[PDB]
RNA sequence: GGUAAAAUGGCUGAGAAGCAUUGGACUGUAAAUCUAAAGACAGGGGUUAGGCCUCUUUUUACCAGCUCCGAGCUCG
């Protein structure tokens, strides 16, 4: 069960991160929101109750994550679940011959810094906090869940920067799982498809929802939260990328 | 000095083995009274001859020097550079007579230490020779007695003294201490000990033993009156630990002799080898004969004052301590032997099959060995019983009488009376060396049986005359017991050399009842002869001896009833047989079949062969094989082929081992 | 305990005796009835102390002393890879049988040497590219050999990738496909056969009693073979019996398509003048 | 939730199939065991209670599956979940040069007939029963879950026949999901690693300890109860479709 | 190089199999066509010259493959390359609710028997012939190349039977490569996309859906990839998608 | 054929990059070496002949790549092939509990900057040069080949930074192929396994003989000449696009 | 069946010592290490100050003994 567990959710002030926070707190767990101060996460933390605490920090900055982790340890005393639902996206073709446009290097670096560099920055820091926990009778110390979109396998036109960042997370999920296996930490990656997040939200949405084989609708963030809970409860789930897409194969 | 010294009784004085001791030491080995068959007995019981420095002979007599030639050719093949003999001064003349029939023996070196020579000392023992002359250059009244004194040994330093002495332990300073304490001294400056008695073992004084030979009552008084004996007997100077007596029991019961032994002291032991021993000497021979007797009893008949009677392998330690060891005493039990034979994988069924299937002259094969005596086969010898009252010996090898005595037991005296003539074929050793033993025993048997001493008839090459003449003139009177006939005078084309020779051969024909006697020159060596006997009954027996396939033998022995032929080698080494002037198995078979004899027998098997020869498919109902102490009659010819399966079963393992060795030799030859 | 002085004084004399002694080996010392056995036992203890003390000085001598693709974690990786190969060999590898029926004929000294050779033989098989499927037949539980084996391997005994059983070779394989290797066999091994099962007797036999393995094989009517040592190399000195480690290395070379002149490289050079 | 759902589990008399049946019945659902009559599935059906009914049938036979499906419809009235946990395995190298042995064609055909042909035979038949269900307010008619081992991606030596059958299930899970998408049926595949099933415990004991130690985390053999938990999660989640999930423990199999 | 090599091509009387045969024979190698007698492969064998011999056999039958392999050994003496380009395809939905139609089991079994069972039947038999070859100085005994369509990863509607058979080949290519690694045989799989084979308005639309080049596949290009695999000694245990970056839609 | 083609090879002064340069120049093509000036690439350019020109530039810097591309255009007039064989590697565990060590962020950023950021920086710039070429009669304008190690699928312990960079290249090879499809540029990725590049032929021998023994067939380290052969095959084949090819030898890497 | 020489049970020696072997270590790139285990010169005996004396086994070499003197194929 997830009763009494303490979880740290990056970017949990909106989108997929908030949905997992709502479910875990409702099930009886405690959550810490880790997202930029401009997102107004303190309003969501107050709404969810006394079990939710907003920690203003930036994933790309080492100092901010360490400060937020110390706040979580001070408030609750331990960290058991780490969910990385933070990440930005950009849309720009690599090269447009007709328009004479070339992809800017700053845009590629900025996306890589948040999606990939930020995710690894969090993982390497929470594990240090996560390593001090007394082993569970099953030998487990905690669960770390990442989020890389389905673009890591099938990118679209102009989705080169997004696919590269998401592709790195999928590739690196196995070495990290092997890295933390002796200390007893499980690392998993979820591959959501088209989800009703603010990042995705009119004619395009209806067409994209119709392109999903079944169900022919956009993803529900509540369903994403359900999959996260299933991974936490199952002790044999490790080192896999799960496509929460709906059997949709993306076209150019 | 040596740390252990003990004696051993190789032969316990029995009539068929004589008496012999064996002194063992870490530095030297000694032998006493090397008689006939001593070489075979010592080899059987695994007695090494590598360092046999000295051999002591107590009396110039054939009962003590009979096996001397065999030991000499053996030590030589052993590689010993020099051997020293001790005893009567006649040994030098005896050694000269040995070279008549043997070679010069250039390899080994011979030395003689007579009693008149100065005393001899060794690294382990000092030996004194005592010449004794009986009451009333050949000398027939000299007997030498030996008194052996061991060297005094030091005493070990008491190593536990290191807790009290001031000497630096584990250093070189022990060497002057060792030179002091072991010699009875002590370095008092290292402490207070002025003598080794405080820290060293008491040195052991030398313990002496005496070997005394008293062949007859005539020697009793000279032994008693000897002053040199009184030096050790009536004194406390190292009382003699043990005295070995080799004298007949009639001598022992004499009061003067009884008082002589008792004067040596109460602690002195007394060991006696006086022909009263009851001990089996040839265990392997007894084992095989008992096993073969289980097949056919007739073809393989069965064989036959405090003091300590000697036994085979009896021991007595002298240097470590002084006890009657008695640990390797032989034990003869026919029940164990038959159990081992019956438990053989194929012996039981084979003899069962043969048994459920179901007179003069008779032949007894005393020995079927070629060159050296072995555990199972003695040197060549064959006895023929023409009539219940007459017999003929076909070859007299070394120790032949010993085998004869074992075969007949107490009946040997009667058998020797029936001995009419002895035939010697070619003058190699181990073919004639046993003759003096037969003659002396024959004289004793005739005296015991109460018969006139008529000289025996001997058919042999003229070269044998010189050998016996020199021995008779120099060492001991023999020639007055025989009337020798040259072998050449009995040839088919021979001529009467002298009327006395014609008179003797006529006497031989009358004595043996033979119709005719013939000889021929076989191709083995210079003056090598065969033989053939025809009886008035009509049966003919042909003996070849050492030879090669020859035509004169075939012509002379035509239509023989039974043929005995040499089978030294097999078909594998026919080249060696030609080089060594011997015949192979198939060569003998071919010669016999060409001669058209009713039956064929083989003997003179090589030392390469251990127990049985190779049974080639050419072995027909006429071809047989010979073993020691087997009896063959003319009615047993059809039975002989039937015995092949049981003999194969009784010797399955060794023939497999022999076949395996031959296969490996062939493989090595091919791969060479 | 009279042993105390018996020795201390010999230690003072320095007559090749151990510097110290323990209780358990002292009881074994008084369980030796012959002075030669005690002398040999004391020399065995004496040389054990000297080699132990001499090798200690080597530690004192040793005390006087970017971009990378991988981490130095190699002893683990080699062990894991050899484990994976062994696991596959336990399913598809060619069986090889070590017969432990010779426990009766071995004294304590030979029993320890048998275990040491078995440890070496198993190690060589593990490192091979195509390992065998090592069987330990007739291994009686709580026996002298079994107790020694679990002592040397400690916890590894339960994890070694080999089949250990109390049954016999005949009870696990068809009698036709079994070949009992021995030096006394009349048949000469010509070529390695991949369809057969080879049995190697776990024997040392210093006090030579030849024919023990041959008698055991003939008792069950099993085929026998002897390595063709003489045919390929010229023998000079030494018994033709070979150690277990040498035998398994010879078989491994033959199993891997090697020729006889290459397999026999593991025979000690102190017996064969050279090849033919 | 899974309360009131009716499920058909192939090979549910032992191994992974029984574990899912125990969990689903315990949660309040109804299950039908579909396994060969010689497996003694009636004993398990009696043990689980009145919500479990044993249907003796063979997956490779069309007639047997149709008879069992009719029994399930008669007993409960509908079919909502189909789980395929039945399958045999063989171990034989493709070609052994040293031993001169070649993989027999009958062994390859027999494994293919049960693992792959049997799975497709069930799927095409339950969907006809599954198609008659009234659509759920979310548009779903039912869930179909398959089982293909991790050998479909990383086979071992001598596991050629097993990998080919399991590989076909992984490849075909996407066309079937697209095939049944308009009618509203979700098709999923689970890839268990080393699990404590009777199919795996047949191996010698030393092998099991070594194989359990080779799993990075947890360093133990799979628990069939954990496999049942994953099946329940797939049923509850409505957005899970057309994916192969490796329930292995991050273990990568070696030759 | 491929000069002097002997290759056995299943289904080489038409489609992709013939294209590889034309290239390998042209490069100087020798090829044996293994396809059903009704395909008229003897005409192609005569056209290609004396280095091509037609062997009438059925992949699904063990006896026919063994007879053809013996013919290849008798004619040339060795086998070095085995290419499996034979296979049929069917199109039928798993279940059609509106029409009340269900996929027939016989159609699924027939496709599985030829595409998957036939491929494994050939592989297990040629390797026995392939194992007797003397090892090359690089340790190689030969190369085996399979063909599984891109449907093994991304099937279409009604392509369930085809994807299952092709999916099995992709999954089994790794155990077979590990199986034959000690004896020195390399096993590879090629995943062609839309190719201008006889098996393939729809054509124009499908050709336009390929990102680049926007045209149907050329069987000559497939033959070129086969030659590259043979020459490269480090290519083993991989599935290569010769598709053109096309991702298939439902 | 590759006769007359002009190729730009990043990091071609050593390792895999030099091997492709030697083969392409030998076949008759023209190559431009793009590697850091400290690597001494001018010596290799002089050795290969007049068809090889060394361009000192840094992939992580936009200005350096643009300068080198202008030099290639000035020397030869066109660019047809772009091969990315440049990249560094690091070995460090994510977290070592026993030693209390944590992976440094600078090491992760440095590896990502060269392997992934550098590769994309080159690709976006050569395509602008590559776009001005007149289309070939087959519609092709040029070929771009990347290099991402097999760690992108199966990383080892401490290979987290390397796998993340290589994993991004594998993931992004498909969007770039779709991006440049209308203009007629083919993008491919090669996944070399354990190749005997200068770096790996420097580890102690025992190590070199283990790694090499773990490859199923051939049981040896990779030969850079073989890597060059695969590059030539991709250039000649016009239907090869949007695929990752594992030039490893069927080796599956263990933890 | 005999004669002589030899015998290193992981391998070479020396007559001490190296190359090796087994269990353990999550090694920061000398782990080229640390730590634990096993170290019996064919096997028995004796003695012994070593070192020698002996028994057995194995391996490798090796295994008949016509003497005289003059006639000079026979004569003593
Ligand atoms: Zn003779
Ligand atoms: Zn003679």
Q: Which residues in chain F are contacts of D252 at CB distance < 8 A?
A: 154, 252-255
- From CA E111, how far away is CA E107, in angstroms rounded? 6
Task: Look at strands F142-147 and F101-102 and give their pairing.
Answer: unpaired
CA distance A172 to chain D (A): 13
Other CB atoms within 10 Å distance of the CB of residue A2: 17
- Cα Rg, chain D, nearest whole Å: 18
Return d(Cα A19, Cα A224) in angstroms, integer. Answer: 8
Residue A252 lies in a domain: no
| Chain A 173-192, CB < 7 Å to strand G | 181-182
Experiment type:
cryo-EM
Q: What is the DSSP string of B421-441?
A: EEE--S--TTSSTTHHHHHHH
Specify the CATH number for the domain of residue A92. 3.40.50.720
Q: Which residues contact F80 (CB under 8 A, 6 or more apart)?
A: F5, F6, F7, F130, F133, F142, F143
Query: Helix (H, G, I), strand (E, B), or coil: what is residue A84?
Result: strand
Q: Which of B372, B369, B423, B373 is nearest to B395 (CA)?
A: B423
Closest CA to D54 of D83, D70, D31: D31
> Which of D139, D229, D240 is the closest to A233 by Cβ?
D229
Protein-to-nucleotide distance from the CA of C113 to the C1' of G8, whole angstroms: 14
C138 CB and strand G closer than 7 A: no
How far is the CA of D172 from the CAs of A139, A212, B146, D83, E81, in angstroms?
37, 18, 113, 16, 30
Dihedral sign, Cα of residue B80, residue B85, residue B91, residue B93:
positive
- Contact of A6 with A32, CB cutoff 8 Å: yes
Chains that touch B (3 or more CB pairs under 8 A): C
Contact flag E117-D121 (C-beta cutoff 8 Å): no
- Indicate the burial class of E207 (C-beta count within 10 angstroms; 0-12, 13-18, 19 or more): middle
What's the per-residue H, E or C state across B250-308? HHHCCHHHHHHHHCCCCCCEEEECCCCCCCCCCHHHHHHHHHHHCCCCCCCCCCCCCCE
Strand stretches in chain F, DSSP E: 6-10, 30-35, 52-56, 81-84, 95-96, 101-102, 142-147, 185-192, 244-247
Q: Which chains touch D (3 or more CB pairs under 8 A)?
A: A, C, E, F
Rounded Cα gap, residues B557 and B518, in angstroms: 9
What is the token pair recorded at C42? Answer: 């004391």
D162, D228, D235, D251: which is the annotated catalytic residue? Answer: D162
> Which residues precede chain breaks (C–N over 2.5 Å) in chain B?
136, 304, 358
Q: Which nt has its C1' nearest the CA of B494?
A: G74
Give the number of whichever ligand sits closest to the CA of residue B567. Answer: 1
Q: Which of helix, strand or coil describes residue F21?
A: helix
- Is any Cβ of chain D less than 8 angstroms from the Cβ of A89? no
Domain ranges of chain C: 2-62, 74-275
**Which residue among the candidates F54, F76, F108, F162 is catalytic per the annotation?**
F162
Per-residue b/e over C64-77, b at no fewer than 16 CB within 10 Å? eeeeebbeeeeeeb
HEC string of chain E equals: CCCCCEEEEECCCCCHHHHHHHHHHHCCCEEEEEECHHHCHHHHHHHHCCCEEEEECCCCCHHHHHHHHHHHHHHHCCCCEEEECCCCCCCCCCEECCCCEECCHHHHHHHHHHHHHHHHHHHHHHHHHHCCCCCCCCCCCEEEEEECCHHHCCCCCCCHHHHHHHHHHHHHHHHHHHHHCCCCEEEEEEEECCECCCCCCHHHHHHHHCCCCCCCECHHHHHHHHHHHHHCCCCCCCEEEECCCCCCCC
Question: Which resolution, in Å, applies to this structure?
Answer: 3.2
Mode of pairing for the β-strands spanning E30-35 and E6-10? parallel
Give the chain D residue nearest C257 (alpha carbons).
Answer: D98
> Tokens representing E9?
């091509």
Question: What is the C-alpha separation between B214 and B251, in angstroms, rounded?
Answer: 8
Q: How far apart are CA A91 and CA A199, in angstroms?
A: 12
What is the sign of the dihedral through the CA atoms of C74, C80, C83 and C88? negative
**Cα–Cα distance list, B661 to A226, B654, B656, C218 (Å):** 87, 10, 9, 21
In a domain, E250, yes or no: no
Cα distance between residue B164 and residue D47, in whole Å: 90
Q: Is residue E95 part of a domain?
A: yes
The helix/strand/coil state of A229 is helix
Domain count, chain A: 1
Q: If we measure between CA atoms, which residue out of F250, F242, F241 comes closest to residue F222?
A: F250
Contacts of C194 in chain D (CB under 8 A): 98-99
On whether the CB atoms of residues F103 and F95 are closer than 8 A, the answer is: yes
The residue among E203, E99, E116 whose CA lies nearest residue E151 is E116
- Could you tell me the residue ranges of all domains in chain B? 5-153+205-317, 159-198, 360-632
Domains B5-153+205-317 and B360-632 share a fold: yes
Tell me whether F88 touches chain C (CB under 8 Å).
Answer: yes
Asked whether residue E172 is assigned to any structural domain, the reply reads yes
Q: Do A236 and D218 count as a contact with CB atoms less than 8 A apart?
A: yes
Into which CATH architecture does domain B360-632 fall?
4-Layer Sandwich (3.60)
Structure tokens at E142: 């030969």
Asked if E240's CB is within 8 angstroms of F177's CB, the reply is: no
Residue A183: how many CB atoms within 10 A of its CB? 19
Residue with tokens 């030579």: C208
Pick from F154, F253, F255: which is nearest to D216 by CB? F255
Distance between CA atoms of residues B120 and B49, nearest Å: 21
Cβ <8 Å between E244 and F245: no
Question: Which chain G nucleotides are covered by protein, judged by CB under 7 A?
Answer: 1-4, 6-13, 16-18, 21-35, 37-50, 52-60, 63-68, 74-76
Report CA dihedral (C57, C62, C63, C65) to the nearest 10 degrees: 150
Tokens of C47: 């040389």
Phi and psi dihedrals of B208, rounded to 5? -105, 150
CB atoms inside a 10 Å sphere around CB F159? 28
Partner residues linked to D30 by β-bridges = D6
* Residue F252 within a domain: no
Q: Residue A9: name the closest of A61, A74, A79 by CA.
A: A79
F156: nearest CB among C67, C70, C78: C70
Q: What are phi and psi of B381, to 5 degrees?
A: -170, 145
* Distance between Cα B289 and ligand 1 center (Å): 24
Answer yes or no: do B160 and C13 touch at CB < 8 A: no
Using the 8-state DSSP alphabet, how is residue B418 labeled?
H
Q: Are E245 and F174 in contact (CB under 8 A)?
A: yes
Helix axes D41-48, D16-26, angle to 10 degrees: 20
Q: Do F242 and E242 touch (CB under 8 A)?
A: no
Residue to test with chain D: of F216, F248, F252, most D Cβ within 10 A: F252
Give SS3 for B8.
strand
For residues B92-118, one letter each, b for 16 or more C-beta atoms within 10 angstroms of the residue's C-beta and e for the rest, the string is: ebbbebbebbbeeeeebeeebbbbeee
Instruction: Say how far apart CA B602 and CA E152 lie, in whole Å.
Output: 92
Q: What is the DSSP string of B582-595?
A: --BHHHHHHHHHHH
Instruction: Residue window 212-241, chain F: list those with CB within 8 Å of chain D.
Output: 216
Task: Answer yes or no: CATH 3.20.20.70 is held by domain B5-153+205-317.
Answer: no
Which residues from 318-357 of B have any strand G atom under 7 Å from their CB? 320
Tokens of F3: 């006769």
Output phi, psi for B283, to 5 deg.
Answer: -65, -45
Task: Give me the phi and psi of C204, to 5 degrees please.
Answer: -115, -60
Nearest-angstrom CA–CA distance, A87 and A59: 10
User: B387-413 in b/e burial notation, b at 16+ Cβ within 10 A?
Assistant: eeebbbbbbbbbbbbbbbbbbbeeebb
Q: Is the CB of B50 under 7 A from strand G?
A: yes
Contact between the CB of B523 and strand G at under 7 Å: no
Q: Which of chain A's residues have a Cβ under 8 Å away from the Cβ of F117? A: 105, 108-109, 112
Percentage helix, strand, coil for chain F under 3-state DSSP, each rounded to 5: 45, 15, 40
- Residues ≥6 apart with Cβ < 8 Å to B178: B157
Tell me whether residue D145 is in a domain: yes
The two structure tokens encoding residue C72: 């130095």
Q: Is residue F253 part of a domain?
A: no
**CA-CA distance, B637 to B632, in Å (whole number)?**
8
Instruction: For residue D41, give the H/E element and its range.
Output: helix D41-48
Other beta carbons within 10 angstroms of residue D26's beta carbon come to 12
Residue (of B117, B53, B113, B50) closest to B86 by Cα position: B113
CA–C1' distance C74–G22 (Å)?
A: 19
Residues D211 and C87 sit within 8 Å (Cβ to Cβ): yes
Among the bound ligands, the one closest to the CA of B426: 2
Give me the residues paired with residue F7 across strands: F31, F81
Binding residues of E for NAD(+): 14, 16, 35, 58-59, 85, 162, 166, 195, 197
Q: Sheet containing F142-147: which strands, arranged edge to edge?
A: F52-56, F30-35, F6-10, F81-84, F142-147, F185-192, F244-247
Strand partners, E195: E217
Assess if residue E117 is contained within a domain: yes
Closest partner residue to C163 (CB to CB) among D96, D100, D204 is D204
Residue at minimal CA–C1' distance from G53?
B26
Residue E9's domain spans which residues? 1-242
Angle at alpha carbon of residue B589, lines to B585 and B592, rounded to 5°: 140
- Residue F156 CA to residue D181 CA, distance in Å, equals 39
CA B606 – ligand 2 centroid, Å: 12
In terms of Cα–Cα distance, which of D209, D175, D206 is closest to D189?
D175
Which nucleotide across the nucleic acid strands is nearest to B156, CA versus C1'? G49
Query: How buried is F109 (Cβ within 10 angstroms: 0-12 exposed, 13-18 middle, 19+ buried)?
Result: middle
Q: In angstroms, what CA-CA distances link B650 with A33, B368, B517, B614, D72?
A: 102, 19, 39, 14, 84
- The answer to whether F75 and F55 have CB atoms below 8 angstroms apart is no
Of all nucleotides in the shown strands, which has a C1' nearest the CA of F101? G28
Confirm whether D95 is a catalytic residue. no
Residue E138, classified by CB atoms within 10 Å of its CB into exposed (0-12), middle (13-18) or buried (19+), is exposed
Residue ranges of alpha helices (H) inside chain C are 2-13, 23-30, 35-62, 74-92, 108-127, 144-153, 212-219, 229-232, 244-255, 260-263
Q: Residue F43's Cα: distance from chain center in Å? A: 20
Flag if E211 and A252 touch (Cβ within 8 Å).
yes
Q: Is A179 on the interface with D (CB under 8 A)?
A: no
Q: Of B159, B170, B671, which has the smallest distance from its Cβ to C14's Cβ?
A: B170
Nearest CA among B411, B478, B441 for reference residue B15: B441
Residue that the structure tokens 């045999």 belong to = D88
Q: Please indicate whether, in this complex, the C-beta atoms of F160 and A120 are within 8 angstroms of each other.
A: yes
User: Which residues 6+ apart lie within 8 Å of D118 measured at CB?
Assistant: D10, D59, D60, D86, D87
CATH (residue range C74-275):
3.40.1280.30
Mutation site for C-interface testing, chosen from D162, D202, D211, D254 by largest number of C Cβ within 10 Å? D254
Beta-carbon contacts of B186 under 8 Å, excluding residues fewer than 6 positions away, are: B177, B180, B193, B194, B195, B196, B198, B199, B200
């Amino acid at each position: 069960s997830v009763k009494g567990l303490v979880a740290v959710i990056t970017g949990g002030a909106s989108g997929l991160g908030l949905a997992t926070a709502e479910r875990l707190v409702g099930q009886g767990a405690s959550a810490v929101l880790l997202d930029l101060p401009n997102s107004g996460g303190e309003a969501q933390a107050k709404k969810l109750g006394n079990n939710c605490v907003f920690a203003p920090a930036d994933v790309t900055s080492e100092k901010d994550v360490q400060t937020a982790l110390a706040l979580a340890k001070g408030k609750f005393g331990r960290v058991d679940v780490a969910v990385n639902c933070a990440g930005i996206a950009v849309a720009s073709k690599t090269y447009n011959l007709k328009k004479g446009q070339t992809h800017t290097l700053e845009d590629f670096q900025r996306v890589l810094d948040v999606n990939l560099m930020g995710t690894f920055n969090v993982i390497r820091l929470v594990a240090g906090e996560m390593g001090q926990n007394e082993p569970d009778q099953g030998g487990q110390r905690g669960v770390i869940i990442n989020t890389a979109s389905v673009a890591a396998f099938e990118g679209q036109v102009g989705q080169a920067a997004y696919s590269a960042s998401k592709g790195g997370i999928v590739g690196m999920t196995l070495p990290i799982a092997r890295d933390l296996a002796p200390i007893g930490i499980r690392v998993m990656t979820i591959a959501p498809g088209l989800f009703g997040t603010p990042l995705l939200t009119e004619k395009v949405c209806n067409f994209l929802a119709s392109q999903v084989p079944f169900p022919s609708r956009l993803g529900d963030p509540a369903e994403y939260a359900h999959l996260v809970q299933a991974i936490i409860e199952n002790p044999f789930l490790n080192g896999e990328v799960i496509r929460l897409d709906g059997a949709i194969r993306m076209q150019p | 000095g040596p740390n252990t010294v003990y004696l051993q009784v190789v032969a316990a004085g029995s009539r068929d083995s004589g008496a012999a001791l064996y002194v063992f030491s870490e530095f030297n080995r000694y032998l006493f009274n090397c008689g006939e068959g001593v070489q075979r007995l010592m080899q059987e019981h695994k007695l090494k001859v590598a360092r046999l420095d000295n051999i002591f002979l107590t009396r110039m007599h054939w009962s003590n020097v009979g096996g001397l030639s065999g030991m000499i050719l053996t030590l030589k093949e052993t590689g010993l550079p020099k051997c020293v003999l001790s005893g009567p001064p006649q040994l030098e003349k005896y050694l000269e007579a040995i070279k008549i029939f043997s070679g010069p023996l250039k390899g080994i070196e011979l030395a003689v230490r007579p009693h008149s020579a100065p005393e001899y000392e060794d690294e382990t023992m000092t030996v004194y020779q005592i010449p004794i002359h009986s009451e009333q250059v050949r000398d027939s009244s000299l007997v030498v007695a030996f008194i052996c004194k061991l060297h005094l040994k030091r005493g070990n330093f008491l190593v536990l003294k290191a807790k009290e002495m001031g000497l630096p332990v584990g250093t070189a300073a022990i060497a002057p201490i060792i030179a002091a304490v072991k010699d009875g001294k002590s370095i008092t400056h290292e402490g207070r000990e002025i003598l080794a008695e405080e820290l060293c073992t008491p040195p052991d004084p030398g313990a002496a033993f005496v070997v005394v030979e008293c062949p007859d009552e005539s020697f009793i008084q000279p032994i008693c009156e000897n002053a040199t004996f009184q030096r050790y007997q009536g004194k406390a100077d190292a009382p003699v630990a043990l005295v070995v007596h080799m004298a007949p029991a009639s001598v022992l019961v004499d009061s003067r002799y009884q008082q002589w032994m008792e004067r040596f002291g109460p602690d002195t032991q007394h060991l006696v080898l006086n022909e009263n021993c009851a001990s089996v000497h040839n265990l392997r021979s007894h084992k095989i004969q008992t096993q073969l007797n289980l097949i056919h009893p007739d073809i393989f008949p069965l064989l036959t004052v405090p003091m300590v009677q000697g036994e085979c392998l009896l021991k007595y330690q002298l240097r470590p301590r002084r006890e009657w060891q008695r640990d390797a005493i032989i034990t003869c039990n026919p029940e164990e032997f038959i159990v081992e034979a019956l438990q053989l994988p194929n012996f039981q069924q084979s003899v069962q099959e043969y048994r459920r299937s179901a007179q003069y002259p008779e032949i007894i094969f005393l020995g079927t060995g070629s060159a050296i005596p072995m555990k199972i086969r003695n040197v060549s010898a064959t006895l023929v019983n023409i009539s219940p009252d007459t017999s003929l010996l076909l070859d007299c090898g070394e120790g032949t009488f010993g085998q004869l005595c074992r075969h007949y037991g107490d009946q040997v005296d009667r058998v020797l009376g029936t001995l009419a003539a002895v035939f010697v074929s070619h003058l190699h050793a181990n073919h004639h060396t046993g003759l003096p033993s037969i003659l002396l025993q024959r004289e004793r048997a005739l005296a015991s049986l109460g018969k006139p001493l008529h000289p025996l008839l001997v058919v042999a090459p003229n070269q044998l005359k010189a050998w016996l003449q020199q021995y008779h003139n120099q060492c001991q009177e023999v020639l007055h017991h025989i009337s020798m006939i040259p072998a050449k005078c009995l040839q088919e084309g021979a001529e009467i050399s002298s009327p006395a020779v014609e008179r003797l051969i006529s006497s031989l024909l009358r004595t043996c009842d033979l119709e005719e006697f013939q000889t021929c020159l076989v191709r083995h060596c210079k003056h090598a002869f065969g033989c053939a006997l025809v009886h008035t009954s009509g049966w003919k027996v042909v003996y070849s001896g050492d030879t090669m396939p020859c035509e004169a033998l075939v012509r002379m022995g035509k239509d023989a009833t039974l043929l005995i032929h040499e089978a030294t080698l097999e078909d594998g080494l026919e080249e060696e047989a030609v080089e060594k002037t011997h015949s192979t198995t198939s060569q003998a078979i071919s010669v016999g079949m060409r001669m058209n004899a009713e039956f064929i027998m083989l003997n003179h098997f090589s030392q390469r062969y251990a127990k049985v020869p190779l049974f080639s498919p050419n072995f027909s109902e006429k071809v047989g094989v010979a073993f020691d102490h087997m009896k063959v009659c003319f009615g047993d010819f059809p039975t002989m082929p039937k015995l092949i399966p049981p003999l194969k079963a009784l010797f399955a393992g060794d023939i497999e081992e022999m076949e395996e060795r031959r296969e490996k030799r062939e493989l090595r030859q091919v791969r060479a | 305990a009279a042993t105390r002085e018996f020795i201390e004084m010999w230690r003072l004399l320095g007559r090749e005796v151990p510097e110290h002694i323990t209780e358990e080996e002292l009881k074994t010392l008084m369980e030796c009835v012959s002075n030669t056995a005690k002398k040999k036992y004391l020399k065995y203890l004496y040389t054990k102390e000297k080699v132990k003390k001499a090798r200690q000085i080597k530690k004192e001598m040793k005390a006087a002393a970017k971009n990378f693709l991988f981490l130095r974690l190699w002893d683990r990786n080699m062990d894991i890879a050899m484990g994976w190969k062994g696991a596959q060999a336990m399913q598809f590898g060619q069986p090889l049988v070590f017969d432990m029926a010779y426990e009766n004929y071995m004294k304590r000294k030979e029993l320890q040497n048998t275990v040491s050779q078995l440890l070496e033989s198993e190690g060589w098989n593990r490192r091979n590219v195509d390992p065998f499927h090592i069987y330990f037949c007739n291994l009686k539980i709580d026996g002298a050999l079994h107790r020694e084996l679990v002592k040397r391997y400690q916890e590894k005994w339960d994890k070694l990738l080999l089949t250990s059983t109390e049954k016999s070779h005949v009870d696990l394989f068809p009698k036709d496909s079994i070949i009992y290797l021995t030096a006394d066999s009349p048949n000469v091994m010509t070529t390695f056969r991949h369809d057969k099962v080879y049995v190697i007797g776990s024997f040392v036999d210093k006090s030579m009693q030849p024919g023990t393995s041959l008698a055991k094989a003939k008792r069950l009517n099993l085929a026998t073979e002897c390595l063709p040592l003489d045919k390929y190399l010229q023998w000079e000195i030494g018994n033709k019996n070979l150690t277990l480690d040498q035998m398994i290395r010879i078989l491994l070379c033959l199993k891997n398509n090697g020729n006889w002149q290459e397999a026999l490289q593991f025979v000690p050079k102190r017996k064969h003048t050279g090849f033919l």
